Amino acid sequence: PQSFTSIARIGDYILKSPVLSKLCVPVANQFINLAGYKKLGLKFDDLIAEENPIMQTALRRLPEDESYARAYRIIRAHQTELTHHLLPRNEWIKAQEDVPYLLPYILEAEAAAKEKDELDNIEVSK
């Protein structure tokens, strides 16, 4: 339940800093490769727990073509998991393909929700 807004704020701070970037990114790259989700044909954004209003808004706004593709990756991953195997190497998601396709929709929904909450509780200073 840490917001993606919070995650991005910390992450961007790391990426923009030459020192922290060269120090953290390599460990992050290793973490992702060890996670092994790409070997099941999944992208990180497919892993995000969706049972919450922000994610439901994001998924509803996701364009059709991408939604169908996300659906396939999820089904294929469940099938591979139940067979206790990994997908053939050529079907693994490549680093270049592990793109944050849902993140922008998520950040947008979070910003709108944050503003509504602020507006619902605004104080008036006469």
Binding site: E115, K116, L119, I122, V124
Partner: peptide
């Protein structure tokens, strides 16, 4: 400015 903020600001 979002449609929401416009409405809330204008009501105030």
């Amino acid at each position: 400015r979002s449609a929401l903020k416009l409405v809330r600001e204008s009501e105030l």
